[PDB]
PDB file of C-alpha atoms in Angstrom:
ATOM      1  CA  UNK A   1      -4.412   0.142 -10.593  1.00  0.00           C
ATOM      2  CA  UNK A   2      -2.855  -0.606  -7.128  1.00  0.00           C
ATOM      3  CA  UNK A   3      -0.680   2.494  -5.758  1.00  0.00           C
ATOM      4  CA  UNK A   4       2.526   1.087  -3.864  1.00  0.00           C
ATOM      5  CA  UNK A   5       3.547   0.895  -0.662  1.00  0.00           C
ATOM      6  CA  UNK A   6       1.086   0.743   2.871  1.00  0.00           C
ATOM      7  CA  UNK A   7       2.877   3.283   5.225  1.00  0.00           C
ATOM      8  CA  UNK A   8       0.606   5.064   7.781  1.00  0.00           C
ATOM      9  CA  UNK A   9      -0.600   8.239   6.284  1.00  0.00           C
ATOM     10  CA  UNK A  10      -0.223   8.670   2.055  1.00  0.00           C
ATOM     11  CA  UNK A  11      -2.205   9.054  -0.815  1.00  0.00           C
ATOM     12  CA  UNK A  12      -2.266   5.411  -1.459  1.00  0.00           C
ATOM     13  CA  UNK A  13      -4.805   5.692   1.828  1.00  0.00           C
ATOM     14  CA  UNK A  14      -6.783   8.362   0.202  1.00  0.00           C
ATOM     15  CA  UNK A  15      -7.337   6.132  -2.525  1.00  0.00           C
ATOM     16  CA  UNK A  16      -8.010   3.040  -0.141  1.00  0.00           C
ATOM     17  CA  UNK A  17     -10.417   5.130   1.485  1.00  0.00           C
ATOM     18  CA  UNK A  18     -12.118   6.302  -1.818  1.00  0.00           C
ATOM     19  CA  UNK A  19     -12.741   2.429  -3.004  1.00  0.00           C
ATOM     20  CA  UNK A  20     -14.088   1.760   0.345  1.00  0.00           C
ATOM     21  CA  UNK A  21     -16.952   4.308   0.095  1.00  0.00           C
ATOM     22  CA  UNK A  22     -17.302   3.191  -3.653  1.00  0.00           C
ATOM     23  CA  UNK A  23     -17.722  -0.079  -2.443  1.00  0.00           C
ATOM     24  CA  UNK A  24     -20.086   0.692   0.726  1.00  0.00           C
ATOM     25  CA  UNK A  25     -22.289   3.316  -2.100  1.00  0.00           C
ATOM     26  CA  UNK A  26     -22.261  -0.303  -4.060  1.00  0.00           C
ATOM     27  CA  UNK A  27     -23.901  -1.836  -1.091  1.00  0.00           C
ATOM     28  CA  UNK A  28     -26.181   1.311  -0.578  1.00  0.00           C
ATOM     29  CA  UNK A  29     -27.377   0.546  -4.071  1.00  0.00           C
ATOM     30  CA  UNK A  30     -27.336  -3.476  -3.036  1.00  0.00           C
ATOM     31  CA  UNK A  31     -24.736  -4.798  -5.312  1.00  0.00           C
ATOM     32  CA  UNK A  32     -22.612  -7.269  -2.875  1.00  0.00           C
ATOM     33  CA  UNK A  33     -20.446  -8.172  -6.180  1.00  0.00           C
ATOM     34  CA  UNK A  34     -19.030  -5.237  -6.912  1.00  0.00           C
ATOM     35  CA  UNK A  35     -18.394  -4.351  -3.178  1.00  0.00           C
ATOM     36  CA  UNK A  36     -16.540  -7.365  -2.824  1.00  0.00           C
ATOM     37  CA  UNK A  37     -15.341  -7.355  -6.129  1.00  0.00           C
ATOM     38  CA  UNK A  38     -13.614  -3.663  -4.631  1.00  0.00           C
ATOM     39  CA  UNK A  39     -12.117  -5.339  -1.285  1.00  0.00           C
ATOM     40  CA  UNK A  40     -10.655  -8.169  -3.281  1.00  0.00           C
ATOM     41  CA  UNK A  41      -9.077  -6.123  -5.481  1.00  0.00           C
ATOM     42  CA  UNK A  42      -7.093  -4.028  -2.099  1.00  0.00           C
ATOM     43  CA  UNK A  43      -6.828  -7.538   0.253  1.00  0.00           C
ATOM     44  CA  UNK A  44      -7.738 -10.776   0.085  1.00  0.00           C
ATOM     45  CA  UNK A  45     -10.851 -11.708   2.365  1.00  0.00           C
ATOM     46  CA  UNK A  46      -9.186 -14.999   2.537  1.00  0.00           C
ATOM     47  CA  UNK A  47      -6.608 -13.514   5.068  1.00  0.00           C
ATOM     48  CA  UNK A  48      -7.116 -14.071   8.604  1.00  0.00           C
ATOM     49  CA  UNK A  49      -3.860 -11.742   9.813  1.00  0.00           C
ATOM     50  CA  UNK A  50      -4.133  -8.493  11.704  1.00  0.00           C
ATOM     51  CA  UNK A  51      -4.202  -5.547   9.467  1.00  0.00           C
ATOM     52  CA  UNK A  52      -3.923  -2.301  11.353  1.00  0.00           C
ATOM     53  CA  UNK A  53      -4.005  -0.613   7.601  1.00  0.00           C
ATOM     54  CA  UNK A  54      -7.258  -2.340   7.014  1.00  0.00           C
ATOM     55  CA  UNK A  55      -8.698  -1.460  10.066  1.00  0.00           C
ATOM     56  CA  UNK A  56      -7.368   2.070  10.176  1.00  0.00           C
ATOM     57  CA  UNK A  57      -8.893   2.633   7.136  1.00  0.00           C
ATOM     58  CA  UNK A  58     -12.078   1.187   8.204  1.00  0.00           C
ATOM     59  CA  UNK A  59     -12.289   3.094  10.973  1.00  0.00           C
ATOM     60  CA  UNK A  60     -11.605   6.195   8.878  1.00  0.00           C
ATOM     61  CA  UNK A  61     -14.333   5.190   6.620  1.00  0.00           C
ATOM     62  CA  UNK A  62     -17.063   4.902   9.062  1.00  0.00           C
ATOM     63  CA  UNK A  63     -15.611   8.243  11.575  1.00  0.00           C
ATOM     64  CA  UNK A  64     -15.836  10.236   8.106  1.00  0.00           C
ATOM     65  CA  UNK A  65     -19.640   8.318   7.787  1.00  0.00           C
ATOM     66  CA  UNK A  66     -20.449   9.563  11.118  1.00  0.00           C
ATOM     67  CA  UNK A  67     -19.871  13.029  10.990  1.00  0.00           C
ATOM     68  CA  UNK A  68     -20.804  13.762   7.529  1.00  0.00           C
ATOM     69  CA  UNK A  69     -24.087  13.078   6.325  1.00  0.00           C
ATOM     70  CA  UNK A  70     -24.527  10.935   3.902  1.00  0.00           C
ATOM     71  CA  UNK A  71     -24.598  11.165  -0.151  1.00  0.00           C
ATOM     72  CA  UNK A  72     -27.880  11.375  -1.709  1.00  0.00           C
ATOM     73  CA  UNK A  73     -29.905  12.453   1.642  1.00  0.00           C
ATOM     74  CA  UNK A  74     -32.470  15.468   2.502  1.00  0.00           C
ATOM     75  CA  UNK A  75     -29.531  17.249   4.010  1.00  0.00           C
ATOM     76  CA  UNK A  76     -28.582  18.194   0.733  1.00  0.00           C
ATOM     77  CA  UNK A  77     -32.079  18.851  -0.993  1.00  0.00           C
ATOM     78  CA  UNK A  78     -31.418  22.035   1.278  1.00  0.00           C
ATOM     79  CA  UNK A  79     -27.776  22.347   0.577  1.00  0.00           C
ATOM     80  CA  UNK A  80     -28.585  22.541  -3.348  1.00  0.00           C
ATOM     81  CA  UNK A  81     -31.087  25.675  -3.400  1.00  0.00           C
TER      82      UNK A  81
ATOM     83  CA  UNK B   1      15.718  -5.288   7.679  1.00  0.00           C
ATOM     84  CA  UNK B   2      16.033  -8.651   5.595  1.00  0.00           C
ATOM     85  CA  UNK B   3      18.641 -11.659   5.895  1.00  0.00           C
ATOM     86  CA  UNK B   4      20.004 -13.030   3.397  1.00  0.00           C
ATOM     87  CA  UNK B   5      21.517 -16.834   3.771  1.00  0.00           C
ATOM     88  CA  UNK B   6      24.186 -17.615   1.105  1.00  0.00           C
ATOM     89  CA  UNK B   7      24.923 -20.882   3.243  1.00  0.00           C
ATOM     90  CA  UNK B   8      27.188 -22.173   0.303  1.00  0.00           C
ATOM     91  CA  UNK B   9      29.642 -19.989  -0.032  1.00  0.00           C
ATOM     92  CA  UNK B  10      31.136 -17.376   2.758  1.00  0.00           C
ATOM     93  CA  UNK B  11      30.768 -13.657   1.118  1.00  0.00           C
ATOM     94  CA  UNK B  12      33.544 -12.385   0.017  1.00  0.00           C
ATOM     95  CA  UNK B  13      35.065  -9.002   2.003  1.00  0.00           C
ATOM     96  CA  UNK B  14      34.365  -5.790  -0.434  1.00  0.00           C
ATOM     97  CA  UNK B  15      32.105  -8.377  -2.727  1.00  0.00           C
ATOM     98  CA  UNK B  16      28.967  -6.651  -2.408  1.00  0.00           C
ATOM     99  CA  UNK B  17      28.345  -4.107  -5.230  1.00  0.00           C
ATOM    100  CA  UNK B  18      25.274  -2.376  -5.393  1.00  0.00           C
ATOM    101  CA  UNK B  19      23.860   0.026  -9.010  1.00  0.00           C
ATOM    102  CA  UNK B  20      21.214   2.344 -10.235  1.00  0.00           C
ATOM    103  CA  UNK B  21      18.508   1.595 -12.747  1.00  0.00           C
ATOM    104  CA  UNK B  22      15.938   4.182 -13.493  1.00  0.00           C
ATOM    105  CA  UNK B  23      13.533   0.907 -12.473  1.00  0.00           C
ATOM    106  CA  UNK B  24      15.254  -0.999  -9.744  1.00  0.00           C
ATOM    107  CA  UNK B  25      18.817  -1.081  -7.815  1.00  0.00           C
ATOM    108  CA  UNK B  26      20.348  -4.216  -8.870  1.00  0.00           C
ATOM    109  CA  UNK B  27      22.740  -5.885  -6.300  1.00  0.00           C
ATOM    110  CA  UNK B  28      26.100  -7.711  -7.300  1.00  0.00           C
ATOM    111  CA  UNK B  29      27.737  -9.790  -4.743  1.00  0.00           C
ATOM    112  CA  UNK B  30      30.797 -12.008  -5.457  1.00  0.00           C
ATOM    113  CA  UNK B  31      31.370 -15.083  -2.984  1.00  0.00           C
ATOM    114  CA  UNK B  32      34.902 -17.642  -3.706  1.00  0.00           C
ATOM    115  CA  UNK B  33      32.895 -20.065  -5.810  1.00  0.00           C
ATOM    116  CA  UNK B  34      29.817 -18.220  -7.013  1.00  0.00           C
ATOM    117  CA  UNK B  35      28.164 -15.247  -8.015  1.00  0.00           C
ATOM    118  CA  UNK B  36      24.785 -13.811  -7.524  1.00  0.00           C
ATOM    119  CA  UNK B  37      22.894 -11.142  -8.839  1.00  0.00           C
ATOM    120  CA  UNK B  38      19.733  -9.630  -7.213  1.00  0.00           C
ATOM    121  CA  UNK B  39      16.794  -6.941  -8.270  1.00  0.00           C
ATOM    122  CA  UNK B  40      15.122  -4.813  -5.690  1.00  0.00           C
ATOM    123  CA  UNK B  41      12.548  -2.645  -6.482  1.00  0.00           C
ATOM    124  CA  UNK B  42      13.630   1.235  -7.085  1.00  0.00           C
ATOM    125  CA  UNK B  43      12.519   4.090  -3.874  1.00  0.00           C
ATOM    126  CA  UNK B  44      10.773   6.497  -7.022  1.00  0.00           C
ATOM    127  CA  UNK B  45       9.601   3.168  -8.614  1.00  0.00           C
ATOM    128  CA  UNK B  46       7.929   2.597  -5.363  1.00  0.00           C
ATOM    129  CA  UNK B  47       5.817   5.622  -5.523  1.00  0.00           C
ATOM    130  CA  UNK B  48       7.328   9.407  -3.861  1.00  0.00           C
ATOM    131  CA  UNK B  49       5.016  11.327  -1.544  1.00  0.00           C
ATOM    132  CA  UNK B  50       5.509  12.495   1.636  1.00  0.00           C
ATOM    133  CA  UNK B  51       3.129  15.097   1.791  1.00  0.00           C
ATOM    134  CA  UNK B  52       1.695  13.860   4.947  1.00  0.00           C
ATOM    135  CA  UNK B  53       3.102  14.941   8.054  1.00  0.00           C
ATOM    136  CA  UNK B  54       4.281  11.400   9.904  1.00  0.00           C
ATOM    137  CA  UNK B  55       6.822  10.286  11.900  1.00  0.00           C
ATOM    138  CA  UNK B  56       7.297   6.695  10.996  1.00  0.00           C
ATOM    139  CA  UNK B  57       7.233   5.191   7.350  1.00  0.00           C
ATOM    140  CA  UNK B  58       7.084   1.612   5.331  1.00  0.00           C
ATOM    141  CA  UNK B  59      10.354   0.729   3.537  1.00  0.00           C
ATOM    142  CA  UNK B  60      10.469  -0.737   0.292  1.00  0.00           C
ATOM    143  CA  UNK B  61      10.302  -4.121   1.645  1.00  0.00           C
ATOM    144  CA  UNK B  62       6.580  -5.301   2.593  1.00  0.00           C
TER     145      UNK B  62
END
């Protein structure tokens, strides 16, 4: 279900973006295969090359980690009543 | 930007013909001893959104 086509900014990075936390709440929930399983199916881990996509995305991922706190905390036992 | 090496035969001047599938633009160019016909995927076929506000943008060759 790839979308097509990198470019800098689309919705083909939201989704990128969306398996990458689907991925990292896989590894939150300790399940490497699936997580991997996920980042195979965007790029190949047997790639050595410079991805600025890859890293922009990553970088994304974790800025978006930072300043949001994260799913299934005590921050939200107070957000929900 | 791609180059293409038809080392064979020169192309011919006016022999490169290019049409519209609703899938893919397919590319007909006519050389003095041979013919060639190529299939390049289509702009819509390779997704349409430019929603986000950029300056810069990937072709539809990768």
């Amino acid at each position: 279900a790839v979308v097509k086509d990198s470019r800098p900014d689309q919705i083909a990075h939201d989704d990128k973006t969306k398996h990458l936390k689907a991925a990292f709440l896989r590894y939150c929930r300790k399940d490497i295969l699936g997580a991997q399983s996920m980042v195979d199916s965007l790029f190949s881990d047997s790639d050595m090359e410079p991805d600025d996509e890859l890293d922009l995305a990553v970088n994304q991922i974790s800025v978006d980690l930072i300043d949001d706190y994260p799913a299934s905390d005590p921050r939200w036992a107070e957000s929900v009543p | 930007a791609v180059r293409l090496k038809i080392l064979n035969c020169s192309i011919l001047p006016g022999g490169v013909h290019i049409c519209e599938t609703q899938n893919n633009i397919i590319v007909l160019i006519l050389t003095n001893q041979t013919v060639h016909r190529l299939i390049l995927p289509h702009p819509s076929r390779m997704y349409r959104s430019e929603i986000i506000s950029d300056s810069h943008i990937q072709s539809i060759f990768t």
